[PDB]
Amino acid sequence: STNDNIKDLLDWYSSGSDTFTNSEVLDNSLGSMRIKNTDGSISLIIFPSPYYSPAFTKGEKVDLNTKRTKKSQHTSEGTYIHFQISGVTNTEKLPTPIELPLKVKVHGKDSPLKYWPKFDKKQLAISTLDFEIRHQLTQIHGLYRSSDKTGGYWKITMNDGSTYQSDLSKKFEYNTEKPPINIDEIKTIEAEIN
């Protein structure tokens, strides 16, 4: 029914994601970051976008809401190394968790909301909002599980006017990814499957 391209997407968005708080920066380089988590694992996260180059200095606490690219490895010394991409932010929290408003429209009709989260962080990376949204669409609305639901777009619109979006027919454009944004400044989140 669907093609390999759409199958790969579904595998991507139907796998999980690592969530970690107050991790610590071991080293920050150009295009990369090495960090240690509260559970003792090291992460090697790559940042390929010139528009989103984390400026955390060694010693700082950070948050992870990232996706792995390779299979993590248990080393000879038993240290656990994760191979993730994008998704580092500051440990700031909002005094209370806010209700992000997601609006989906499947083939014209405004579809009901199910499973949709509520976040407590001041800021989240966009690729994160991308995995949270699209994952919702795959489980609940059938995105990538049928030939007739393999496209469309999500579009976050900020309070200041500025917007961000992604085409559901391709994987998130990691290399042109902007820096994290304040989820408390998101006015509306739209999604549309076609």
CATH fold for the domain made of 1-17+89-194 = Ubiquitin-like (UB roll) (3.10.20)
Given resolution (angstroms): 2.9
Beta bridge partners of 98: 119
What is the domain partition of the chain in residue ranges? 1-17+89-194, 18-88
CATH fold for the domain made of 18-88 = OB fold (Dihydrolipoamide Acetyltransferase, E2P) (2.40.50)
Beta-strand ranges (E) seen in the chain are 18-29, 32-36, 42-46, 61-68, 73-74, 80-85, 88-89, 93-98, 102-106, 109-111, 119-121, 123-124, 152-158, 163-167, 181-182, 186-193
User: For the purposes of burial, counting CB atoms within 10 Å of the CB of 52, is it exposed (0-12), middle (13-18) or buried (19 or more)?
Assistant: buried
Are 79 and 42 in contact, with CB atoms under 8 Å apart?
A: yes
- How many angstroms separate the CA atoms of 65 and 124, rounded? 8
Q: What is the largest CA-CA distance in the chain?
A: 55
Distance separating the N- and C-terminal Cα atoms of the chain: 16
DSSP 87-112: -EE---EEEEEE---EEEEETTEEEP
Tell me how the structure was determined.
X-ray
Are 45 and 88 in contact, with CB atoms under 8 Å apart?
A: yes
* 1-17+89-194 matches 18-88 in fold: no
- How many angstroms separate the CA atoms of 163 and 105, rounded? 18
